[PDB]
Structures are given as C-alpha cells and as structure tokens.
Amino acid sequence: TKERFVISRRRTGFGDCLWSLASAWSYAQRTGRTLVIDWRGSCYVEQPFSNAFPAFFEPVEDIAGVPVICDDRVNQLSFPGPFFPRWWNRPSIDCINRPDEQIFRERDELTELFQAREDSEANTIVCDACLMWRCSEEAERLIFRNIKLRSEIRARIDALYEEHFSGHSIIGVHVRHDSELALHQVCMAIRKAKALSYPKPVKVFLCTDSAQVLDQVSGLFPDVFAVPKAEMGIEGGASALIDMYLLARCATVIRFPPTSAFTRYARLLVPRIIEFDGHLTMIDNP
C-alpha cells in the first residue's frame, strides 16, 4: 500500500496556517494519507527553504493517527505524483507563474475535492492556498491539542499567565489596524465586556499592532496589560503565538475584526465572544 500524501503549505499568519493545517489534516485522516507540514517561505523566517514549523513547534510524527512529516525532510523527499490540484502536474518551468487567480482557483478546487465522496486518485495533494473554514471545528481543536509550542514560547505564555491571568478573569481584546471612531468603538466594546459578571477580579489583556491603540486604551481603562516589547522575524512569530494562546485563556474575548484568524483559537475555547457586526453582539460558548 504505497504511501500517499497531503502537503500543507502556508506562509502567512499563524491563525491562517493552523486553520489551513487542520483542513489538510482532515483530508489526510479521511483518505489514509501522510500529512506533510511545509512552512518553507514563512513570513517569519528569513531563509526561504527552511521549514519554519520546527522553529515554533516541537517535532511531531503523528496527529491523531495521521503520520506527520514536519521538518527539513521536505527538502529531501520526492513526493509522488500524480498531483492534485492539477496545476501541480505541470512542469516546473510552467509553475514559475503563480498569480493570486491561480491560488484562489486552488482553494476552490480543494474545497470541491474535500466535499467529494471519492478520494482523489492523486498520490500527493498539494494544499497551497487558504483553507480556513474547510474542516470541522473538531479538526481545528485536534491541531491545537496535538502540536506543542517550543519550550521557550510556552515559558513566556506560562510566565504571563502566572503574572496576570492566575486568580483573575481576563478580558482579551484583539485590535488589528475614523481613527477616533475606531477607538470609540473599541472602548464601547470594552465597557460592554466589563459590565458583564465575572467570578474573579477583572483585567484587560490587549493584543494590538498599534502602539497608539495600546497607549490610548491603557490610558482609558484600569488594569490594561499587553505582552511587552532574522531574529526579529522569529521574535515576531513568537509574540504572535504568545498573544494567540493567551487570548484563548481569557474569560471574554473582543474580536476587532471577528474575521481575523488570529482570534480563532480563542473563539473555539473562550466562554464569551464579543464581535462588532455597527452594533456589538455576544456569543456564548456554549
């Protein structure tokens, strides 16, 4: 029974990478294929042929019964054809041109495959498009529970948890950036979240890319805190993961925007989610 494969390629933010990974995992699980995690060319890693997965996560060779290849073996192994999507059967000279039109075509083609009754005859499925929303929420939860952050990253999460979360009910706020309007809307969301009842004293954990948002929100509410401060790339990735994982430890999370995969892990785990969609709404989980 010759080994067959699903390659999960993603190079964008980790929310997207990990959601997309879950979709690839799910198809591998369903059709009895090996999952290859291929994060060469990551936005966080300077070296273009280095698989970024091991820079952030520990080695993994099985996820819930699916064999996994997650390391620089992607540079050694020749994955067998035929390939799906069909574009991947083209000669490599014909693959230099890979515009966004082709990437979206593949997203759709993979979506159709994943909905189809019959397994593909292709020996290697190459997933090199966004596969957010293309799997069950249990597949997403499986990924998060069965890959393990590198110890240096877990240590930072554990310290901040000890320092701020333990003994408290934390309201997490993700703000990814008229400016005045946006700030007012954030404050109203925080005010709404703070009026809810919590079992422990409340603090506000802010994750934002804007120093101005941090400065202003911190100046407008008590007990606001944030995670402080080639190596810049890795540190950028670590800080992202720290924020993502700590958000999933909050009592309530405010998603600005709720379309961001950054807060997906939090969405799966946190008891209460507040989203703009403008007026605010709240999702009880469960």
UniProtKB/TrEMBL annotation:
Chain positions recorded as GDP 2 binding sites: 44, 174, 176, 243, 262
Keyword match Glycosyltransferase: yes
Binding-site residues for GDP 1, renumbered to this chain: 14-16, 44, 174, 176, 243, 260-262
GO molecular function annotations of the record: hexosyltransferase activity
Annotated GO biological process: oligosaccharide biosynthetic process
Pfam family membership, one: NodZ
Domain GT23 span(s) in chain numbering: 1-284
Alphabetical UniProt keywords: Glycosyltransferase, Transferase
UniProt-listed InterPro entries: GT23_dom, NodZ
Protein family according to the UniProt entry: Belongs to the glycosyltransferase 23 family.
Protein known as: Nodulation fucosyltransferase NodZ
Annotated organism of origin: Bradyrhizobium sp. (strain WM9)
Lineage of the organism: Bacteria, Pseudomonadati, Pseudomonadota, Alphaproteobacteria, Hyphomicrobiales
